[PDB]
């Protein structure tokens, strides 16, 4: 996988040149925001169960046919598999937030997942809707100011939102 530093390293090595001053300054600015990235990762991790469960309940309320008999979320095993999948997507989006680059999320979770859900009959659009609900809940947890040093976390929130809709597009 690649992280935020290593992405720039890989482009520079492909071009076979040293990192320029501007690239090093950009990485220094990335280092400057590392605390916000770590605590956003921590906040999502500490609220993962609530995010997954609330998003799932909202999804089955908006799409009752998922949980009605014959639905893809009907029966306990299918319902638990769906919850697990929500949690897996959330965990890999936290990985991507932690590294600062989407390589782990694509390589380990997203790439080929659409074909997996096509092969299983899992409605990928409904998975995308679930991922959007997780995104909404997760952005609320990252953005709440209680019990934390106040600051501007808009850049990291935008990066997290980008990872989440990337997951939603990948499963659709």
């Amino acid at each position: 996988m690649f992280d935020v530093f290593t992405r720039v390293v890989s482009q520079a090595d492909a071009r076979g040149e040293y990192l320029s001053g501007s690239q090093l300054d950009a990485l220094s600015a990335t280092v400057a925001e590392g605390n916000k990235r770590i605590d956003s990762v921590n906040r999502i991790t500490g609220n993962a169960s609530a995010i997954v469960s609330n998003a799932a309940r909202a999804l089955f309320a908006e799409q009752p046919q998922l949980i009605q008999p014959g639905g893809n979320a009907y029966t306990s095993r299918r319902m638990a598999a769906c919850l697990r999948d929500m949690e897996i997507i959330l965990r890999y989006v936290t990985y991507a937030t932690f590294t600062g680059d989407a390589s782990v999320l694509e390589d380990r979770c997203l790439n080929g997942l659409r074909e997996t859900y096509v092969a299983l009959g899992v409605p990928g659009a409904s998975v995308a809707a679930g991922v959007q609900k997780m995104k909404e809940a997760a952005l609320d947890i990252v953005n709440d100011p209680n019990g934390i040093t106040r600051g501007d976390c808009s850049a990291i929130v935008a990066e997290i939102a980008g990872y989440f809709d990337r997951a939603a597009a990948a499963v659709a």
């Binding site: 893809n72 638990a80 694509e106 997942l113 092969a119 009959g121």
Partner: protein, 194 residues
Amino acid sequence: LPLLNYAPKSQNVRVEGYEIGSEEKPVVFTTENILSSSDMDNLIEAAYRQIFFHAFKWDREKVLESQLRNGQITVRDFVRGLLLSNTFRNSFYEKNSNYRFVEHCVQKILGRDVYSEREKIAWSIVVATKGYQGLIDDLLNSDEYLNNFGYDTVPYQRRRNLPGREAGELPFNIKSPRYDAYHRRQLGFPQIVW
């Protein structure tokens, strides 16, 4: 009857990779390291992910786990018990054709993709002739398995990621879910939304 002869195919595992340990090197979960109970939990979960992708607690084999913890059995024996377990038979054997059961056996025991359709065809007769456990033991006693994972190491997808590349081959749990379109249409999915 001898197995059909099938030609190999160019693969990363067939060739020397000059690998240096990194984030893409699969973690070696081995009982040779005298693992504590929490490290054994990690090793056991690695075996569950390799064999069943995910194991609900209905799918867990607590008797096998206790036996592996006590040293009664090796890691390879635990892998065999996972493959002979009810979860594996119901999810991967029952819901798939024999050919797509050889795949889900080559992929997660040997840690490599099948060479071709011919390999799938050749190994698919083994269940009906030598028995299910016959196939499991043939794959576990194979030179490929013993040379790669031996008795004490959990198998894994081998050489998935080449160095420097952003993405390697698809993980087998993504590439090959438990069932495919045959059992999908037997179930009645895909379902229309709205």
